[PDB]
Amino acid sequence: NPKWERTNLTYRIRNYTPQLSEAEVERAIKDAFELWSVASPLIFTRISQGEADINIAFYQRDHGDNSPFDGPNGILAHAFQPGQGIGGDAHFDAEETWTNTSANYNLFLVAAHEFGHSLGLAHSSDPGALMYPNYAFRETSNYSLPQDDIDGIQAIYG
Numbered sequence: 001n002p003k004w005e006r007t008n009l010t011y012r013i014r015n016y017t018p019q020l021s022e023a024e025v026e027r028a029i030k031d032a033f034e035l036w037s038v039a040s041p042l043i044f045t046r047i048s049q050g051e052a053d054i055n056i057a058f059y060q061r062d063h064g065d066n067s068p069f070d071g072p073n074g075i076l077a078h079a080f081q082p083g084q085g086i087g088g089d090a091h092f093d094a095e096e097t098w099t100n101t102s103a104n105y106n107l108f109l110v111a112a113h114e115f116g117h118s119l120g121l122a123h124s125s126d127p128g129a130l131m132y133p134n135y136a137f138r139e140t141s142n143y144s145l146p147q148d149d150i151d152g153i154q155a156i157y158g
């Protein structure tokens with residue numbers, strides 16, 4: 001069980017995707033962190049620069065981590081388990097079509113999935129869970145965490 005021993009964690013959006021405005025990217029990320037906050041003791045703080053616990057970036061193919069992305073579709077992003085350095089960081093494939101609609105792919109939902117990994121959760125076999133290996137659109141307007149995901153952060157933190 002890798003987990004954060006601290007409860008206030010900072011994050012930094014290193015770069016942006018040109019497909020969305022910055023406000024939309026910052027909003028997608030903010031809301032994604034709030035789904036976890038409301039079901040756990042974690043507080044997320046955004047820093048405009050400096051070293052953050054969780055770095056967020058949009059990278060392409062080879063991007064320095066031995067986990068090369070793969071062009072459109074296929075893997076959409078990845079995140080690292082709780083830890084120092086690359087630990088906790090979440091990378092998104094810059095070659096995907098990021099949206100904030102029902103069109104593939106919706107950034108808030110992929111960010112919400114990735115942040116689960118950053119907090120120590122693995123994939124779930126429950127197709128209704130957000131932590132399920134494959135993406136599926138779910139309305140995001142007043143989106144809330146599936147019970148399985150809630151069971152998951154609750155088991156690591158409290």
Ligand SMILES: C[C@H](NC(=O)[C@@H](CS)Cc1ccccc1)C(=O)NCC(N)=O
Nearest residue numbers: 074075076077109110113132133134135
């Ligand atoms: C397999 C691939 N999965 C991924 O890229 C996940 C790697 S941690 C990210 C993910 C998973 C579920 C919900 C949102 C984001 C995927 O779903 N690709 C898109 C597809 N379904 O067409």
Ligand SMILES: [Ca+2]
Nearest residue numbers: 071073075093
């Ligand atoms: Ca891809």
Ligand SMILES: [Ca+2]
Nearest residue numbers: 053085086087
């Ligand atoms: Ca980190």
Ligand SMILES: [Zn+2]
Nearest residue numbers: 063065067091
């Ligand atoms: Zn990466």
Ligand SMILES: [Zn+2]
Nearest residue numbers: 113117123133
């Ligand atoms: Zn995943």
